[PDB]
Amino acid sequence: MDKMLEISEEAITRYFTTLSQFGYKKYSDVDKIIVLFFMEEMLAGEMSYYVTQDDYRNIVNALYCLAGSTCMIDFPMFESYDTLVHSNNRTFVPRITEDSILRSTED
């Protein structure tokens, strides 16, 4: 994966940063941290060979419940260039004003 490692490192670093500034973090949030690094350990070891694609789907959809749950776990950002409404850069090049039998015609 190489990204669960980054997310977990960020999460525990933020956890201990809060424990440095403050002396308290919600244990309801420490539970999410615990789930996160347990999954990170399990997927990056000898236990990943039991993972199917359905298992991967379920694991990802369960992990995304942790995404914006706390300040420590944050929504990951991936490299994407898409959107729900894509652009139309096609160009119109008519040929000799030629209509076809029914439709118009281009190059």
Partner: peptide, 19 residues
């Protein structure tokens, strides 16, 4: 300026009429 569907229909039909 703004176009509706019918405006495009008129434009395309008038194109095809004279082609």
């Amino acid at each position: 300026m703004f176009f509706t569907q019918e405006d495009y229909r008129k434009i395309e039909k008038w194109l095809l009429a004279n082609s």
